[PDB]
């Protein structure tokens with residue numbers, strides 16, 4: 001069964017790259033503003049130092065992840081003013097030069113589907129004073145020593161990196177990932193990529209308009225499907241927020257003491273009897289911080305594996321053409337385009353799909369004069385009465401000639417050989 | 432060293448020294464202090480072992496990656512981009528290092544580029560000719576076929592291209608002659 | 619958490635970034651590679667008289683490709699390059715004597731600790 005038509009399909013893949021960076025003030029969480037509790041807590045300083053070392057390790061690893069995914073190339077390419085790409089329209093994934101953020105249309109759609117817990121990192125003391133505290137969750141966190149640190153690269157820098165990658169791929173093919181960028185017309189690059197899945201160039205050059213229309217329609221479908229999906233990127237936000245709020249809620253546990261309020265214990269009890277209750281509370285709250293830090297470490301390990309996978313995809317699907325099955329989408333991989341998303345990356349994989357199949361009878365070899373002829377790079381098929389040779393992935397019948405097959409042995413060994421004539425296109429010219 | 436330093440914590444006991452507690456206190460009153468110290472030191476050991484487990488998992492991932500590199504870069508030639516260095520991978524050599532491995536990746540880098548005008552096909556006699564495995568270029572006046580990654584110009588012949596269809600469909604076809612290197616010999 | 623006052627000292631060189639208020643650093647209009655990351659794109663360094671300077675980190679050089687619809691670029695020479703990659707493979711192996719760490723040579727502490735043997739195992 002040989003396909004007769006094709007389909008050009010664009011699919012999306014979503015990957016998380018980084019998580020929220022956090023820091024803890026140990027004394028602020030355990031004791032608040034009680035001097036006596038701090039003097040009692042001075043016996044456990046090593047544990048707070050150890051917890052902070054673990055958190056800072058996680059925090060620097062997050063920036064390393066983002067650097068490894070997005071900052072591969074250090075040349076910031078610019079897209080040409082003339083958009084003459086053989087009828088392919090990349091306007092939906094190129095940066096809009098009029099919005100404040102220089103983001104593409106699809107990136108703008110993606111950024112409105114993930115809602116960050118807090119926008120901005122400057123919440124002033126005067127902003128939440130009195131009622132607003134203990135009602136707004138961020139201020140409740142911040143009055144107990146729990147702070148969120150901003151990432152090193154802003155959204156605009158990552159958008160710049162993705163736009164540089166896109167301009168490189170559509171102006172220079174895959175050469176800019178191996179060295180200096182070498183310019184090439186876009187249709188000739190498309191013909192090279194068709195050569196790389198086993199389809200001859202003339203198929204692309206004859207069907208160029210159909211292929212361009214299919215690509216444009218697929219991009220339009222992607223756009224119309226996003227303005228209507230990103231759970232992998234929302235669950236990271238939800239998990240970090242939930243962990244911080246659970247730490248804030250666990251401050252109402254007695255742990256076997258008379259009360260959970262230090263000020264209630266410090267009044268009504270003298271130091272020798274207040275010390276044992278404060279000690280119980282201190283042990284419980286150190287355990288809560290330890291549990292939080294351990295689960296943060298395990299989550300950071302998972303995010304690191306995801307970011308390594310994203311870097312490998314960026315290298316092998318965007319900066320080249322991949323032959324490993326299902327790594328860069330479903331079908332024969334043609335090319336990929338990256339887009340930045342909040343805390344992650346989206347890949348647009350363009351692949352080739354065989355469309356309409358027809359049935360033929362086939363044979364391994366042809367027996368002409370006691371010789372066995374085999375196809376050089378095709379397959380032998382029959383429409384019922386006549387015998388042709390074609391290519392495996394597209395139906396393009398041709399007459400069997402000697403410049404088209406090769407001989408090996410006689411006809412006594414091949415199991416299913418058939419009888420037919422081989423043109424040998426020299427005899428007419430010699431005559 | 433952090434485990435050794437954490438032995439000076441009281442954990443809410445009178446002292447952190449067992450011998451100091453065992454003298455000056457009788458067994459029924461020394462038992463509660465010793466119990467506090469025991470609980471604290473078991474917690475320290477537990478924390479150490481947990482962080483060792485997480486670090487061991489990270490080292491295991493790194494070692495799996497190193498084994499894959501040894502198989503695919505040293506025992507073969509890899510076509511996946513940037514796995515075995517920057518550029519077209521040629522070969523790799525391993526060297527041992529304390530607690531690790533170093534790979535020496537030899538790769539090929541294209542050096543000096545020149546500009547040419549190009550065309551998808553050639554129209555000879557109402558036929559369209561396409562390169563078998565090269566690209567069509569022009570120095571300004573003449574047309575040659577070359578290979579993509581190195582410049583080695585050659586004359587366009589029929590043993591060098593292949594025909595498909597007429598010249599009415601290919602967008603940017605150009606007019607040139609195809610040698611056909613048999614006619615002189617037949618004459 | 620200050621927009622430039624809840625500060626220890628004001629001094630001079632008060633500079634506002636999206637990471638917060640920075641005091642004690644001079645702001646320059648250049649863009650170097652990042653030495654010490656401050657955040658939100660801002661980096662710091664110690665330069666030339668010597669002083670701490672704060673700047674916006676550069677992402678790299680900007681070069682535009684000369685694209686046309688009938689123009690190709692072919693390499694004429696090559697280079698053979700050898701590069702190195704370093705990978706960790708193993709870590710230190712350790713063992714702990716639980717009784718030696720918790721009790722030392724105290725017999726009484728060991729008799730008390732006999733209630734927790736499962737955890738050491």
Ligand SMILES: *[C@@H]1O[C@H](CO)[C@@H](O[C@@H]2O[C@H](CO)[C@@H](O)[C@H](O)[C@H]2NC(C)=O)[C@H](O)[C@H]1NC(C)=O
Nearest residue numbers: 004005006007008209210211213214217355356
């Ligand atoms: C191969 O498939 C394409 C569809 O992907 C066919 O093109 C369509 O043809 C119908 C009518 O034949 C038109 O109504 C559609 O608008 C066409 N689609 C596009 C995108 O232009 C094409 O005709 C098929 N070719 C063969 C030989 O079957």
Ligand SMILES: *[C@@H]1O[C@H](CO)[C@@H](O[C@@H]2O[C@H](CO)[C@@H](O)[C@H](O)[C@H]2NC(C)=O)[C@H](O)[C@H]1NC(C)=O
Nearest residue numbers: 083084087088089090091092096105216220223
């Ligand atoms: C490329 O795609 C864009 C987006 O679909 C096209 O611009 C649209 O053109 C239609 C009319 O055909 C307008 O109604 C839309 O408002 C346009 N959108 C935008 C964002 O401007 C564009 O015409 C296509 N072709 C080219 C060559 O760019």
Ligand SMILES: *[C@@H]1O[C@H](CO)[C@@H](O[C@@H]2O[C@H](CO)[C@@H](O)[C@H](O)[C@H]2NC(C)=O)[C@H](O)[C@H]1NC(C)=O
Nearest residue numbers: 360381382383384385386387388389397398399
């Ligand atoms: C199998 O293919 C052969 C060869 O192409 C077909 O024979 C051609 O049929 C057309 C239509 O009648 C004629 O115009 C050609 O002159 C025929 N060529 C030859 C060499 O005879 C044949 O029709 C096909 N068989 C079937 C069952 O479709």
Ligand SMILES: *[C@@H]1O[C@H](CO)[C@@H](O[C@@H]2O[C@H](CO)[C@@H](O)[C@H](O)[C@H]2NC(C)=O)[C@H](O)[C@H]1NC(C)=O
Nearest residue numbers: 547568569570571572573574575576584585586
């Ligand atoms: C383009 O290439 C042609 C063909 O090689 C060059 O023509 C040759 O030029 C040399 C130097 O003058 C002569 O010795 C050869 O006899 C020429 N060959 C032919 C077939 O005429 C031509 O010089 C090149 N054009 C440019 C602008 O460099």
Ligand SMILES: *[C@@H]1O[C@H](CO)[C@@H](O[C@@H]2O[C@H](CO)[C@@H](O)[C@H](O)[C@H]2NC(C)=O)[C@H](O)[C@H]1NC(C)=O
Nearest residue numbers: 120121122123620621622634635636637638639
């Ligand atoms: C610090 O406060 C200043 C003063 O209000 C802020 O500057 C304003 O920012 C808003 C936000 O878009 C603008 O609409 C105002 O026009 C700005 N006013 C002036 C005078 O610049 C500034 O945003 C604050 N700093 C930070 C980091 O949030």
Ligand SMILES: *[C@@H]1O[C@H](CO)[C@@H](O[C@@H]2O[C@H](CO)[C@@H](O)[C@H](O)[C@H]2NC(C)=O)[C@H](O)[C@H]1NC(C)=O
Nearest residue numbers: 540541542543544582693694695696697698699
């Ligand atoms: C290709 O590049 C090499 C350099 O990598 C060139 O060889 C050098 O040539 C210069 C003078 O032309 C000598 O001084 C160097 O010592 C050579 N290098 C080596 C390693 O031998 C070579 O000439 C270039 N070839 C072309 C055609 O440009």
Ligand SMILES: *[C@@H]1O[C@H](CO)[C@@H](O)[C@H](O)[C@H]1NC(C)=O
Nearest residue numbers: 001002003356357358359360
């Ligand atoms: C090929 O033949 C099988 C056998 O009946 C049939 O089921 C199948 O539909 C045929 N394929 C096409 C494309 O007609």
Ligand SMILES: *[C@@H]1O[C@H](CO)[C@@H](O)[C@H](O)[C@H]1NC(C)=O
Nearest residue numbers: 362363364414415416417418
């Ligand atoms: C195919 O099967 C038929 C019987 O159904 C048999 O006669 C014929 O020799 C077989 N051909 C091959 C190539 O196996």
Ligand SMILES: *[C@@H]1O[C@H](CO)[C@@H](O)[C@H](O)[C@H]1NC(C)=O
Nearest residue numbers: 367368370411417418419420
């Ligand atoms: C092919 O031809 C040979 C001799 O011409 C004959 O022996 C053989 O049976 C033929 N194959 C058939 C009829 O399938």
Ligand SMILES: *[C@@H]1O[C@H](CO)[C@@H](O)[C@H](O)[C@H]1NC(C)=O
Nearest residue numbers: 543544545546547684685691
């Ligand atoms: C190729 O042409 C472009 C267009 O001006 C030019 O910028 C570039 O330097 C040229 N390449 C070489 C190697 O001269």
Ligand SMILES: *[C@@H]1O[C@H](CO)[C@@H](O)[C@H](O)[C@H]1NC(C)=O
Nearest residue numbers: 084086602603604686687688
């Ligand atoms: C290249 O662009 C020119 C206009 O700048 C146009 O006339 C020519 O037909 C184009 N050729 C191809 C192959 O697109």
Ligand SMILES: *[C@@H]1O[C@H](CO)[C@@H](O)[C@H](O)[C@H]1NC(C)=O
Nearest residue numbers: 554555557598604605606607
């Ligand atoms: C190529 O030749 C054909 C006929 O010889 C002519 O119609 C066509 O215009 C030519 N192409 C040019 C002049 O670009």
Ligand SMILES: *[C@@H]1O[C@H](CO)[C@@H](O)[C@H](O)[C@H]1NC(C)=O
Nearest residue numbers: 644645646647648649671672
């Ligand atoms: C930096 O640029 C701004 C505006 O472009 C200007 O006001 C300021 O004086 C400049 N700083 C220096 C040191 O030149």
